[PDB]
Amino acid sequence: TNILAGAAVIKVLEAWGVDHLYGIPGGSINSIMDALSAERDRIHYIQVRHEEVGAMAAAADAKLTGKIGVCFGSAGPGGTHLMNGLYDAREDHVPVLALIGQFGTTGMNMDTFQEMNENPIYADVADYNVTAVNAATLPHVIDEAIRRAYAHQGVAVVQIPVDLPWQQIPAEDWYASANSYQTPLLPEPDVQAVTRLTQTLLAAERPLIYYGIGARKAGKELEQLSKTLKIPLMSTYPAKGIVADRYPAYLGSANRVAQKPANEALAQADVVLFVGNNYPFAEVSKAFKNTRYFLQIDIDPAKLGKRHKTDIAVLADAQKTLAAILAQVSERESTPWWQANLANVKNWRAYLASLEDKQEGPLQAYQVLRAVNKIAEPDAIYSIDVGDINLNANRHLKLTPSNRHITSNLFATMGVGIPGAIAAKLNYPERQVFNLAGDGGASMTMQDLATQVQYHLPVINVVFTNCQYGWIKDEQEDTNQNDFIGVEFNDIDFSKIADGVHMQAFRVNKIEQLPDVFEQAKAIAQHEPVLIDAVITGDRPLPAEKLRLDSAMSSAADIEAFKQRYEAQDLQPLSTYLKQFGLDD
Amino acid sequence: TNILAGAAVIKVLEAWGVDHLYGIPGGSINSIMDALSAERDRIHYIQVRHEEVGAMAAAADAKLTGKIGVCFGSAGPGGTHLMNGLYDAREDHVPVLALIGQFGTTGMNMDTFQEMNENPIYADVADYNVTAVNAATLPHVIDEAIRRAYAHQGVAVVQIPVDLPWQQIPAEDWYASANSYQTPLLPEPDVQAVTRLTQTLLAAERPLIYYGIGARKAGKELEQLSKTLKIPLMSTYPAKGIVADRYPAYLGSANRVAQKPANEALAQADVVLFVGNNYPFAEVSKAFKNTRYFLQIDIDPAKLGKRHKTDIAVLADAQKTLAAILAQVSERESTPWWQANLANVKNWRAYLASLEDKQEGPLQAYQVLRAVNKIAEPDAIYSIDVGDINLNANRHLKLTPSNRHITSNLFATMGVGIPGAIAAKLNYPERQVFNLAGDGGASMTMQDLATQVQYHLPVINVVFTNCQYGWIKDEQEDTNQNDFIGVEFNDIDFSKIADGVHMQAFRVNKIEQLPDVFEQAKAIAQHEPVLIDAVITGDRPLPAEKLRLDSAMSSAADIEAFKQRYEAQDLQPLSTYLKQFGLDD
Amino acid sequence: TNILAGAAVIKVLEAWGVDHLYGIPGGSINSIMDALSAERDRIHYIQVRHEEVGAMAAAADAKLTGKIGVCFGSAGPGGTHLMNGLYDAREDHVPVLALIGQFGTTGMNMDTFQEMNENPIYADVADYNVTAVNAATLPHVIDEAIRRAYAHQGVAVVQIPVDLPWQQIPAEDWYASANSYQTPLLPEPDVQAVTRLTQTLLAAERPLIYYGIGARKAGKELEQLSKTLKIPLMSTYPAKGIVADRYPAYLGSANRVAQKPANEALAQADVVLFVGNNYPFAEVSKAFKNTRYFLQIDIDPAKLGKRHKTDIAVLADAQKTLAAILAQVSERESTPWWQANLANVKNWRAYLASLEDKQEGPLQAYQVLRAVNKIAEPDAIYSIDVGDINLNANRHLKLTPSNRHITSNLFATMGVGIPGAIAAKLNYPERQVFNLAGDGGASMTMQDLATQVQYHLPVINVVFTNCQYGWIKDEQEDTNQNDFIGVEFNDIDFSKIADGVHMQAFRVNKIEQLPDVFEQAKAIAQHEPVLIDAVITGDRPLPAEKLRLDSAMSSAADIEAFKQRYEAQDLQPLSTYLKQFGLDD
Ligand SMILES: Cc1cc2nc3c(=O)[nH]c(=O)nc-3n(C[C@H](O)[C@H](O)[C@H](O)COP(=O)(O)OP(=O)(O)OC[C@H]3O[C@@H](n4cnc5c(N)ncnc54)[C@H](O)[C@@H]3O)c2cc1C
Ligand SMILES: Cc1cc2nc3c(=O)[nH]c(=O)nc-3n(C[C@H](O)[C@H](O)[C@H](O)COP(=O)(O)OP(=O)(O)OC[C@H]3O[C@@H](n4cnc5c(N)ncnc54)[C@H](O)[C@@H]3O)c2cc1C
Ligand SMILES: Cc1cc2nc3c(=O)[nH]c(=O)nc-3n(C[C@H](O)[C@H](O)[C@H](O)COP(=O)(O)OP(=O)(O)OC[C@H]3O[C@@H](n4cnc5c(N)ncnc54)[C@H](O)[C@@H]3O)c2cc1C
Ligand SMILES: COP(=O)(O)[C@](C)(O)c1sc(CCOP(=O)(O)OP(=O)(O)O)c(C)[n+]1Cc1cnc(C)nc1N
Ligand SMILES: COP(=O)(O)[C@](C)(O)c1sc(CCOP(=O)(O)OP(=O)(O)O)c(C)[n+]1Cc1cnc(C)nc1N
Ligand SMILES: COP(=O)(O)[C@](C)(O)c1sc(CCOP(=O)(O)OP(=O)(O)O)c(C)[n+]1Cc1cnc(C)nc1N
Ligand SMILES: [Mg+2]
Ligand SMILES: [Mg+2]
Ligand SMILES: [Mg+2]
Ligand code: NA
Ligand code: NA
């Protein structure tokens, strides 16, 4: 006849297909805990060691599977600890439900222990942000929160006074709307607009197709269009892997987490097809200042003409539109622009290989990533933290459509490596999972290495120990007048941290040590987590946004200093290849 | 003729006497970093490993010295990481300035990398919350923020677009108002009201004086009034130490972080003098339901009649008022109420001593704290985390007016032990400093053990490893119908964590191991930090709020179960002593 | 045994002495209405015609009496209509309680009719901002709101779900803390700081005392210090009347709502004693750019050194400090500085009198205000709207300590004239009350002239009809490159509007009509409200901030143009008087 309101809430989560959720208990959320306890055969609670890891893992769940992530925090400090993960979910536009403990309705507004008005705390981050005040409507409020988080691709927060889930409600009244769920409709491309777009693209002297993760379903069409039309491809960093890295006309990404060929080509291009792309550097870096025609395909009307004035804009699904272009074109002959870019890519990849292929000496980030490549399975998943690792992984990882990689794309919160890998292994127990993190980021969430141990999640953790916030040191080098500050710090031995949480680990500092240690790690991670602490040099990775290679643009002295510092003696500027094929810079 | 606006900002901090500040750099705050770098001889930047530790340490600075604490975080995730420390500062009403990075005014509102409207993030926590938009007024905005944080005893947040501090401003225009600073005026007690208050207090059959930290300047007057009038003393937990723990009529604190004699006496009292006290449990625990007359002294009109209806309310300084009462009274003879309470205290202290005085066997929290007492200097400072340690430290630490102790009093954020100890050692390098933390709380901020190492801060860290969130397990025992959940977890060896950050450490699990390890730690902390990981039992500490000792109130079976579980065979209920002296319960 | 929670809420209001409150009913607040309906003998509900008028009137109640003002609005649009009054109360730092309707707890968060999360709406304006969720604690929440509004001198907002006030609660539990309310007894002003401040003031060659409303209790001391020491007085506009306008050495106020002698003298002064003053134009107008020493007295630490670099800032009560200064000084002979300022004031007053004393012709604001003066009782209260009326009333009204005048000082919301006058008459039925308003501001709240009729509040309304937003037209003349826009509009005949709400009224457009109309109005307002619609010219009043009178500073052409436009042929610059008494400019 009756059900506890907390039991009904957990049944709402189950109806929506929530497999696992994260948090840390407290008095203010013990009634939800009680309902979870009864339901442990059907829904799986993951106890983290810091609530930010719970929120970040919930975000990562949604990034990986498209299913809403769920986390919770107790009243006051439990909930405020969620913030970095909630902001990550907002900025990366993935659905997350966050439940926040609150003291009982009889004690609210009495200024009792750890009791405050919690609603204003979450107003900025959340698409939906409500304090529940009734037990009978609580299942509906949770249902509403989930349905909105999905529809609006963001964060729904519900503060729950602890008395409500222990109250009996009628067993027959509540329901979940999960059965009625659908994903948004995919708009179709206008035939005339697609034809006009195709004509402009074909008439270009120096075309590029520049796609983001909005094109994640269109890898085949992107590569086929590139091959057929002889048009180079470039992408946002997160869109690495949609087309295989091995594709010879994939230039990489632009700006800083970037590859040289992409920056150079973008500066020269006359027509850009900008597809499923919200590149946040467009305006500030003047990326498109010399672009003659700008053609955009996006599903979101809020994005059309956002990053540059459009000459043709198509409000449609990326794959449907790219298919429609491909359907109306035929094989084109090679062009000077095509060949110049192909040559430039070859030159760049030879540079990266030269760094990877060192066999002995002081360990650099480049060989560590080569060692990752050597033990990586074809469908491996990479959880990547924030800093130099984004740049280095972007250059060195050899990804295909079979891979996944995730980071904090836009909020760019450090510490996401560990939680992202926890979520990855929970969602894909049979797939190999890496956590690639700098020492600064790994330090921030280090305690949750214990969570990998506790739940026997065989993540391969690789920490890049430079004893610096390298990403920031390099920024200070570029901008600051006075000495470095706050960017060089004391060593932490992560192999000892790992030992502390009862995880097998290794520490290495020489290139020649890599093969055996990585082989051992590969084997250990068949059953248990493992950590490799790679002590790397303070060498700055080549700044693709600050090239000093072209004698028509840089002094002979700046060029040779750049070659020496970045081991880039064999790099040629794009202009070399443009000139070979009869085009001017 | 000109000065960089960032240089002027740092000069404002120097004028206000800021010695040290905390944070982690980033591109969005590198211009403030540049100004700090130039000023490193005069103001001292402390690089933390997680920004929440910076915010918590800033809060602790203000708790300890009364001087505004200063922290910062980079745009987006740097700033949102500050939240647990900022909420701590708000709820514990201490002045803190937080600077938040923001991207340059040319890139704001362009939806660029890690760029968002940051002002709404801080609206709830902050007394003052502004985004600076001009370089010439920036020193004033910082000055304003500091002056308001002090006057309003809370958090001032300023978001700073990174371009502004690198702009030149006239050298002669800016100023700091530090020279004009004063603390609020101390109101004087009305003579007639004090006399009426004194008469009511003297006419009481079962009086208590119940003080909080608002009486921190009135220790001498409190103890003297108690001795002269034969009136027992009780306090809030944070007010432990204002009167020496050894004082035989100090009952301790009420509720849960509490001592038995205080809970029992409060239930029986007819008149309570409530002084400098904002006890958050007053209403929810029905603390004063049987109190006949309620007399209050507080400096804040917002507090008068807040926690119970007052019969006499005095808007005045605690010390001035207590002095005025003492001036108009003379020595009173002993009473039955006085003797019953004295006997009860003796019985309770003998119980605590019996726990402390065990010499061998499985290690409990009680002997760990005895070992702390044995190596503690008379003016030691204690930074205490959140959980069972608050209860255990409250019972076992032997404090006097010469000590300081701090925790997160009201927000009660876990993880404060480490940052509180960092702040304590920075402010009091010649005083012994302890960090007393449970394993859950220590885990949350563990990475900043590295900060103690980096800045050579000789903190004595003591971790209470029960492999539980014990405080929460006990709550689930009390309230939950279904099995424990999320409260028992895997071991972390903190002696290995310490080794990882290059700190000397010990792990112990037997009572007989304590003396030598604590002696070694005492010696090490003359020069360097040290950590003791104390592996303790899962024994629940005696619940002072759930006594089962009085046969007129509890079954014989519940009483003997309580004695057995809490080793409390020799405890007597207050009623025993009331009856001895001819008073009924 | 039991009491309705709504009934207890009204008893809390009665305990705090709330005489009257304002609002408009709705379904979402009908349970509070129900409780008010039973208590008509003890609390007086005023039904307004627009909720902003209720909020503005509540703010005005507190401005006038120092007692908390109370208003309410129904859920959604009722509450949001309060905003202009709530912001006025926040900015003018007066205590106001606002009750906001909400739908019942069973329908909250169901997305029902007019149902939304109302808490974020009031977060910015409110010092205290909570949604009640329990009936038994509702009286406490209201009590807390009141106590906080008083303590923090601002707005407390409580959102009340409509079901709660109809729930029975135990009769014996609730209480109000009004009985605890008191004002603090302060120590004497800091003796050594006051002595030093005094020496600096007396050593000055060109001293000024510049006070604001913080000196409201110090009129006697201000005038005596001025006379004894030969130091001219100037004030903020709202501080007009604290010293009688007829005082020969009262210079007026500075900036734009200002008088010529104050602006001229301030520019010359070497030492300013800034007392109970938070002049918002200090920095932006560079008011103190030439000041050698700046001395301050203020009760609020947040203000110490806020507006200018301050040589000595005394934290103390204005009256007590000024009395302490007076007690340690004695007579100084007349100085050139004193004589020059006296002469300048005389010249300025002759100018104002020349405008007032016209007897025939096109009506100007100047003669209307002379007509007000001629019918004004010595203790009349003036509610003044926002625009040219602030400037003209500041110059022409002849106020003494027996008067009161109020406007929206800092938020400066138009429309306040009508509600301020309603509040004034409710608090002071036996005092004459004027509403002096421009046509723009009167139009915004015109419907509430019906409220004066409904409650038989004999306000004398005087509307200054120029068919312009004159204040803004003048700004456009000063700053805008293109034609006037939005500042000249169609006539509204307010005598006809008055007829429509059943109020006796007159319309005048000639100077010679004034005496008979104002005599009739004076007599009508012995019993009923009345309105005079004064059709005035579009003449720009003399801009005290743009003086062109001094041959050393302005071209002869500029001076002749200024003199012509502003009928200022007989005005002399201060430099003329300075030279006369042997001082240089
Ligand atoms: C430390 C760090 C540094 C970084 N620096 C760089 C850098 O230098 N270079 C770089 O490239 N990135 C960088 N980033 C990542 C960067 O901040 C952005 O997140 C990224 O460039 C945006 O990628 P995106 O447009 O693919 O994704 P999003 O911003 O998520 O945009 C996806 C777009 O696709 C659209 N879309 C979605 N579905 C469809 C569909 N079915 N059909 C059509 N359109 C669809 C959406 O409406 C949206 O406009 C960095 C990240 C980090 C952590
Ligand atoms: C895990 C945990 C559990 C806790 N549980 C308990 C518990 O069971 N029991 C317990 O007691 N505490 C407990 N607390 C602490 C608790 O939450 C409160 O912070 C504490 O009880 C309030 O102490 P207080 O009134 O001294 O301090 P505050 O809340 O800071 O109040 C100080 C008061 O003094 C007034 N004041 C300031 N200056 C003066 C002056 N010069 N003269 C007069 N008045 C002045 C202020 O206006 C204010 O009202 C716990 C804390 C933690 C971390
Ligand atoms: C259209 C319009 C135009 C305006 N333009 C002008 C203008 O040109 N010129 C002008 O002068 N005004 C002008 N104002 C008014 C102006 O905006 C400010 O409100 C006013 O100048 C500030 O006056 P104040 O300092 O007296 O009041 P407040 O800002 O209320 O300051 C009071 C001060 O006194 C202190 N205080 C309070 N009690 C005590 C005490 N017991 N002892 C000591 N200190 C105490 C307070 O802490 C505070 O610092 C205008 C208003 C309007 C509506
Ligand atoms: C009613 O309040 P509460 O829930 O009892 C309280 C005091 O708020 C606590 S206490 C607590 C357990 C602390 O565990 P520890 O292992 O550090 O200590 P212990 O085992 O009790 O010695 C948690 C998780 N929380 C909840 C909590 C969660 N997350 C953070 C950041 N802070 C908290 N404090
Ligand atoms: C312009 O953006 P940014 O400042 O360059 C950026 C990307 O935001 C970074 S990157 C970064 C350094 C990361 O250091 P690591 O040691 O982990 O990596 P690395 O040494 O570069 O290999 C910091 C501190 N921040 C700032 C930062 C601070 N705190 C958090 C929680 N996240 C951040 N991400
Ligand atoms: C710099 O401040 P400001 O813009 O000069 C100021 C004081 O804020 C004014 S004054 C003003 C004109 C008032 O016109 P009236 O006809 O009432 O008066 P007047 O013609 O000047 O005698 C307006 C529209 N505003 C703007 C205004 C608009 N709307 C509201 C509700 N209040 C305002 N006050
Ligand atoms: Mg690093
Ligand atoms: Mg524990
Ligand atoms: Mg007008
Ligand atoms: Na951490
Ligand atoms: Na209106």
UniProtKB/Swiss-Prot annotation, chains A, B, C:
EC annotation? 1.2.3.3
Q: Which domain of life is it from?
A: Bacteria
Q: Where are the transmembrane segments?
A: none
Q: Which cofactors does this gene product need? A: FAD; Mg(2+); thiamine diphosphate
Q: How is the cofactor bound?
A: Binds 1 FAD per subunit.
Query: What CDD domains does this protein's entry cite?
Result: TPP_POX (cd02014), TPP_PYR_POX (cd07039)
- The ranges of region (FAD-binding) come to 184-334
Q: What class of enzyme is it?
A: oxidoreductase
Q: State the residue spans of region: Core.
A: 1-183
Tell me which UniProt keywords the record has, alphabetically: FAD, Flavoprotein, Magnesium, Metal-binding, Oxidoreductase, Thiamine pyrophosphate
Look up keyword Magnesium and say if it applies: yes
The catalytic activity, as recorded, is: pyruvate + phosphate + O2 + H(+) = acetyl phosphate + H2O2 + CO2
From the UniProt entry, list the residue stretches annotated as the region Thiamine pyrophosphate binding. Answer: 335-585
Question: Pfam families of this UniProt entry?
Answer: TPP_enzyme_C (PF02775), TPP_enzyme_M (PF00205), TPP_enzyme_N (PF02776)
Binding, Mg(2+):
D439, N466, Q468
Q: Name one GO molecular function term.
A: magnesium ion binding
Summarize the protein's role. Answer: Important for the aerobic growth. Decarboxylates pyruvate in four steps. The energy released is partially stored in acetyl phosphate.
Domain comment, as recorded: Each monomer is divided into three domains, each of which contains a six-stranded parallel beta sheet surrounded by alpha helices.
Assembly and interaction partners:
Homotetramer.
The entry assigns this protein to a family as follows: Belongs to the TPP enzyme family.
Name recorded for this polypeptide: Pyruvate oxidase
